[PDB]
Amino acid sequence: QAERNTEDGMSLIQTTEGFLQESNDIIQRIRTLAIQSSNGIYTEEDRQMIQVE
């Protein structure tokens, strides 16, 4: 049963991780968007469009 509990623990940890993969790609996407935003000729109106994203 201890082996089983260890395995149930594995699932929590992987489940959590899947949500964190979800978490990370968003940061990577926001970084992509930040680089576009950091372009000083990219306008404020267009930046608001990015800020929605």
Next chain:
Amino acid sequence: QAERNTEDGMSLIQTTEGFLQESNDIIQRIRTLAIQSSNGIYTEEDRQMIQVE
């Protein structure tokens, strides 16, 4: 994306330059006109015609 921003920057700079080519040919034309104007027998009435230009 940084490469792209560099390229978008190129466009601003080139666009600006095109307007400055426009700016310079005018000065060159005004100089041509100024030389005609600097002719002391070129009359005041004719100078007004040049001054329109």
